[PDB]
Design a protein around this ligand. Structure first.
Ligand code: 4G0
Ligand code: 4G0
Lengths: 244, 244
């Protein structure tokens, strides 16, 4: 009954599929799953092992302190996910060596109706599997985590927001400050304009604050933008008041 | 019995504390928790409400489509976490408007023995709470998620790796490719040097590959580095071979 149509299917390859309950069972993403706007399906390489101890790691050629994902169980899990996905599924590997995710990249990834996310553990996966099985390698940021599961979940959450029905950044700026009750909090008052009921004055104040915040915190983000006439004016005003 | 000492305590304020099972119950972080190297303690603003329906959101002054976290339950939850933490706990708010996390920032945050992480939902929290309760505002990347929980979990995982006992980036470079069995995979062979047993040749090959990979994928990362004599040489060699 809930209108889908732009529903999204996401296959996940992970040694710890139960981690994905954090997004499939709670909040907005949990609702998206319940309403069939989002489907997350997990395959565990451990289920594709054949030895008694269900071995899923293997030693790197050339030595070193780390292990890699064992090729055969991982490869078989990926092939099974691909078979379930059918035609048109893009296979994504999350790693610190990948293309850096930003909101633009999220909107690009969100254009896919089917994704398969491969979650590496240990020191990652065999380079030849990346060559033969992986379409795109992405990073959620310049830091190292214990597995690709949190990055995969982060990507799912980010793209889920663009699925119709699931739900100032949209303009490439940081957001303005927001206020709610009470009118006075530890001596700090709400900006009078927000309680004026003057919608146009409130819009312009918020936009001016967003411009000022972006300039002060992330000035490089401004360089990437072609500001509107109005934005140029409000930013100039904010900068003048800062130097005043 | 497991040596701790540099153990870390992390308080979390979240409307969905059960999401944090994804890190406290599984993998390396799950082991860290079991071994008392890492403690994660959650407070839910819903438990600090007094009305019949346990209301945790509130309307923004000045209108708009979104809601904010209700101040009183959130504020009381934060104060309770602070009381439990005692002296010296840094309070962190995760938002897209915060300082961008990278590995350097992770190592800085990891110097804290106590952290409190505040997870915003809806359109975030009252600006005056950020002023009065929050020490530092951090972002895990330039994208928007449905809540601060995945960013909080991402930060916990990243900093947990620096807790002694819990466990090429360390040099500011991307990692080299790695290989494991089989020797031939879909016609693709393992680089002969990795099966040569010549440790010095293998080290230099890996370093050269890391330099080449960083140059090709993330050249800006190289600008931030003062390369060693050896790194300058191997990078020059890799670049020469690319133009050859
Ligand atoms: C070489 N190595 C340690 C490694 C290689 C691949 C995957 C993993 C799993 N960890 C991840 C994955 C992604 C990210 C990210 N920033 O998107 C951070 N951590 C580790
Ligand atoms: C204004 N707004 C929508 C908002 C404001 C604050 C928090 C939140 C919760 N969502 C988050 C949190 C952090 C990150 C990050 N990149 O670290 C991404 N999403 C949303």
């Amino acid at each position: 009954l809930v209108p889908r149509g732009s529903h999204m299917w996401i296959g996940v390859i992970s040694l710890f599929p139960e981690m994905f309950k954090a997004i499939t069972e709670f909040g907005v993403t949990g609702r998206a799953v319940k309403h069939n706007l989002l489907k997350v399906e997990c395959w565990n390489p451990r289920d594709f092992t054949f030895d008694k101890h269900k071995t899923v790691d293997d030693r790197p050629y050339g030595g070193g302190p780390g292990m890699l994902m064992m090729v055969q169980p991982l490869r078989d899990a990926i092939h099974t996910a691909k078979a379930a996905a059918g035609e048109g599924a893009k296979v994504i590997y999350l790693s610190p060596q990948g293309r850096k995710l930003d909101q633009g990249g999220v909107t690009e990834l969100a254009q896919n109706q089917k994704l398969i996310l491969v979650c590496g553990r240990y020191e990652g996966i065999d380079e030849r599997l990346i060559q033969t099985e992986i379409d795109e390698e992405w990073s959620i940021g310049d830091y190292v985590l214990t597995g690709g599961e949190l990055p995969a979940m982060t990507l799912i959450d980010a793209v889920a927001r663009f699925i119709p029905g699931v739900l100032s950044f949209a303009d490439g700026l940081l957001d303005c400050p927001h206020y709610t009750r009470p009118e006075v909090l530890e001596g700090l008052t709400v900006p009078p304009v927000l309680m004026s009921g003057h919608h146009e004055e409130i819009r312009k104040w918020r936009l001016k604050q967003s411009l000022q915040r972006t300039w002060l915190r992330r000035p490089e983000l401004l360089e990437g933008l072609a500001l509107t006439d109005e934005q140029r004016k409000l930013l100039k005003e904010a900068q003048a008041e800062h130097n005043s």
